[model samples]
Target chain A: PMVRVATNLPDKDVPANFELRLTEILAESMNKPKSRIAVEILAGQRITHGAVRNPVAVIKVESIGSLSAEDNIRHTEKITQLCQEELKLPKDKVIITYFDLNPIHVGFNGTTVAAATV
Target chain B: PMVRVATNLPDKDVPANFELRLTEILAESMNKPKSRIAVEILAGQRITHGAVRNPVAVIKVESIGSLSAEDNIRHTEKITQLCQEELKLPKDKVIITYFDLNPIHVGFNGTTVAAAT
Candidate 1:
């Protein structure tokens, strides 16, 4: 499973422990093992919502199975709060998109996650 | 329409004109009005493809109507080439995702793209 969080908070520096804390939160929220999760953070992006310069984030969560509309809504709530607290952004500023990839669409170690996990 | 290009090309500096050129390309590729297009670039990320350090990109294109799988494949080809040439990345390293937002799903100026546009 991979969670990619990209934000455009110009000049805002993320805390050093942000990734660690995020990993913990995601693991608990998604019911995935910590070892099976990968998190990437991209800050200092040039983005806008509503055609204005506001703090905005676009989060992409890709996983194999175990993702549903209900799960996404739950994850969004948790992640939105995290962004507001850690990134100091408002809840409305965050937009999260969930991608449930087949094993073939995702790869690891030069092989698909399906093949590798199996 | 909004196009967000995020890549994990560590320590790579994009050319100053990259965004301008990207906006031009996306407008032409997506067939959206240049005025209606918004492009965002986020580089220097900590990302990995195949579980190792490799130049990887995840592009998200959000628009109200007028986006399809065929169009996504077409845009993917053009964008892959552009990344390889400008960012010095490989074609296989890039991944493009398309989102066709309903007017309700997208907003501009405190109103929906459906209403604002």
Candidate 2:
């Protein structure tokens, strides 16, 4: 199964290479291959954090049967740092949520990831 | 807490009234009061499903200690219908993901929802 990272960042235009970099980071952090990663970056979004309009980012990471409380804590720290350093967002301004899904629920190549031999 | 719905729809201008209506619908569906519901709609996003470029929506619903497998199945049906009718999206194009989180994880009004009461 693939590790899918979806992000909601402020209206500043994101660099073209951001996704590629994110893909690499996620693959490395999640201990997955680069080919098993997907990144979706949505910029120029009207997002609010701490009940105020600020330069915030809300990111969701979804994977299959590979995340735990310890892993999530590490990811939260790693991704929060990345967002702060790369996007210039504050640590509190970045909210990273992780979702661990059943492999059968995520599909790829017209078949469920659970069925895939990856 | 609260029921927070975050959506990523295709490139189309969502009507201003959509969030309000969604708030009402979710409040009713989840048996939560309207005042405790939060809705975030992100439109004009680039998303794909089944590895193909189609008009798709990925929704994440987060709440505190109020969701179950049965509840999620029902919400999935209800939300799929809502997207299909309101956004004119196909039923298969919608993917509704549910998140049941600790109240402490979600903060509101300068305090964690767990400590709100």
Candidate 3:
């Protein structure tokens, strides 16, 4: 099983330095090595669209952790709190998802015996 | 939570008709609308490589149902049993998964006010 912790950091007018600090805070809280994390930026306008303006920066932290749900939830909470303080992102914007992955064995051609070994 | 039911039907030397009936059995057991069901066949050769032969036919049934874990497990079990009897597949080969989905909201530009209400 694996845990996915995601946070939406809003930095409409905030300085790029602030965004960097937010990322640093998040990376530290997740205990993730700097090399393992990736960041994405999302841009949208609400006034013309007549919707809420919420250009967000999303970070997804994936970890191979114990097969316990409680531990996963705790990790998500820790990351969310870090974002709230460092990025000033409202609590509602962050989302986390956890998934259990298993391997699949598939055979090839039309021969059953040959497919099994592969 | 949503339920995903998957089964492997082994045909080996059997004709395609048997494979079609296996699909019919799956659709019936899951009480699934055939329109939404999909069947995929995997082919492979054996003997030359010297190994057990197990060419597999996989059928996946997806349904939008209640959000309970127990019910999802039950649905998965029902489909598994159906495949076990109808297709003669070993119990170890069938796999099922359940997932819960939620939506995300993102905004544009680098402005907070412009980004949020």
Error of 3 at A46 (Å): 7.0
| Best model number under lDDT | 1
lDDT of 2 at A32: 82
Per-prediction TM-score, please?
0.60, 0.58, 0.31
Cα displacement (Å) at residue B43, model 1: 7.5
lDDT for A41 (candidate 3): 37
lDDT of 2 at A18: 71
DockQ of each: 0.14, 0.13, 0.02
Q: What is the C-alpha lDDT profile of model 2 across B45-107, one tens digit per residue?
A: 565567766677777777775588888777788878777778888887777767788644443
Q: What order do you get sorting by TM-score, best first?
A: 1, 2, 3
Q: Write the per-residue lDDT of candidate 3 for residues B1-117, one digit (tens) a residue.
A: 112222222234333444344345445555654432333333332212124444333333333343257665765676566556656655665555543322211111221211233
Residues A1-118, model 3: lDDT tens digits: 1122222223354444544554565456556555544444332211100112242223333343331444444445665665566556555444333332222322224544334455
User: What stretches of model 1 exceed 4 Å from their correct place?
Assistant: A10-12, B6-38, B42-60, B63-65, B69-117
The C-alpha RMSD of each candidate to the native structure, in angstroms, is 6.9, 6.7, 16.0
Q: Fill in the DockQ of model 1.
A: 0.14
Model 2 CA deviation exceeding 4 Å by range:
A1-13, B1-39, B43-60, B66-98, B102-117
Off by over 4 Å in 3: A1-31, A45-60, A99-118, B1-117
